[model samples]
Target: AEQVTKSVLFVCLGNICRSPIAEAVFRKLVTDQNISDNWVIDSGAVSDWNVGRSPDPRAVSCLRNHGINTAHKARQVTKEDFVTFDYILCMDESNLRDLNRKSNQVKNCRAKIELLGSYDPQKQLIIEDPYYGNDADFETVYQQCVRCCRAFLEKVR
Candidate 1:
């Protein structure tokens, strides 16, 4: 028997920071559960600025602290993503608004656009961007993603 695939796309202002960390955390959770093949997981930016860049060096270091490896090339969210992903989870209100606005332009958009922090068990409703922030901020984003992704994976599974 085959299980149906579940797809999710994480989004933020730039793909280098929060979204990529969330994607990596969620991917790790699925892999740890031995269910990676049943999921389609990716992360993207709401803007085109960081397209084709690697995850931020600070973000990479933060994830490394938890033994998580991130091999992500930044990409801008596309209209096709609205049709392809089951859920388009964003980091903050700006991203949520951007995704919702973009989704409206795509006819028959199927993905549910919402803030990824909404899944945080700690009740932190926003995962702030760490692009211009310090290394500690990246660590904070990493911690938030871990909590939120763990809760989200539990709910979806």
Candidate 2:
């Protein structure tokens, strides 16, 4: 028999910008609500571009400015992630495409994949990218992610 558990993984192009930010924000949100142990949280890059590196300094700084601890080492998505995570959320269409390419590596993984913003209705209109822009984009991304994370926290309970 197969083991089952609830977990979430965020994905982005480099992992340094969006996914790391999402991971920190999501974990922080869950911690604040004291609902962390009910689920697992993680992040990854669609490619190996920033594997082993910490999140982009600007991304870290943005979260720090908001009083959320933002420290995370980058990692590339793996085949095991599909089975390990209950939900794998893509930061954008490009990352979604890359994750889809890797979808074949795990059994029963496709239905578990989705977008982070789908948790909050308002954010469905925008999923900001911080790579090509400045620190301000990270701020926007942080706020959106927090909102979604909060919603998830509520839903899970």
Candidate 3:
């Protein structure tokens, strides 16, 4: 096993779509269990396209419908994140690859980068991006995120 810490960063292509959802869902999980104080959670994107912005209106709508309030403003992953976060998690393989590439450029980058779902062996799944799909697709992503985040709690505990 590897040495583990509590800080975490969730990354996606735009942060507005997938990563924020993961951030929100996971935060809810920790809070519900009264474990928020012991953990640090945040999110970002591989790119700055939506930097300083919030999640896609549709994405926000999906969570709001389900009573999950996620206050996320899009931000690009910074080199500082490597030093600040103990774990850097991506929503999919592509984001993981990109995040790894960028993190490698920074001498301070030390956190382990991985897909958010990679911690859950039994699930064997990734949270698919629901960017161009129907509202139902976003809802599905939310549910899967909840499940994956739930699994992560068990792993890190």
Candidate 4:
């Protein structure tokens, strides 16, 4: 059986916190469903500040608690990504503005840039940054991501 690959790029200000967690959660969801082969999933940063850095420790811990593991390294969004991923989903308004601004330079950007939380079944329109927050905050991010990613995958399926 041959299936078209659907790609998604998750983004946040820094790759360390929210976006990487989202990417990992989505990957686990796909893996659990045995449909991982039909996906190209990754996470990135809008700012270059965390390029090459590891995801935040709190985020890593939170995922481990949920039985998910990640080895994602932070990367900055590139012009090529605009045409590569089918959906470029970001964490908040700042990421939206930066990604939209960067997409302007590409001649034929094909990805749909939108908030990742837009698909949250609970109506949470934004996934707040938990970089400086406590473990509880990171846990909140994880919960929101789970709700959003499950809904998103269902819609896409």
Query: What lDDT does the true structure give each of the candidates?
Result: 0.91, 0.78, 0.84, 0.93
Ranked by lDDT, top first: 4, 1, 3, 2
* Candidate closer to the true structure by lDDT (higher is better), 2 or 4: 4
Candidate 3 residues lying further than 4 Å off, grouped into runs, are 1-5, 120-124
Taking the tens digit of each residue's C-alpha lDDT, what string does model 3 give over 38-148? Answer: 788999988888899978998889889978888789998888999888888888888878987888888877798888777654575687888899899898888778777
The sequence of per-residue lDDT tens digits that candidate 1 reaches over residues 6-91 is 99999999888889999998999999999999999999998898899998888888889899998899999999999999999999
Q: What is the lDDT of residue 135 in candidate 4?
A: 98
Give the residue spans of candidate 2 off by over 4 A. 1-5
lDDT of 2 by residue, 1-157 (tens): 2333467898888888888888888888767766676768889888787789988888888888988886578888898898778788877777777788788766777437777788875856347787889777778888888777777657755
Preferred candidate (TM-score higher): 1 or 3:
1
- lDDT by residue (1-157, candidate 4, tens digit) is 5678899999999889999999999999999998999999999998898899998889999999999999999999999999999999999989999999999998999999999889987888999989878999999999999999998899886
Q: Give Cα distance to truth, residue 138, candidate 3, Å.
A: 0.4
TM-score, every prediction: 0.97, 0.88, 0.91, 0.98
**lDDT of the structure predicted as candidate 4:** 0.93
Backbone clashes for every candidate come to 0, 0, 0, 0
Best by TM-score: 4
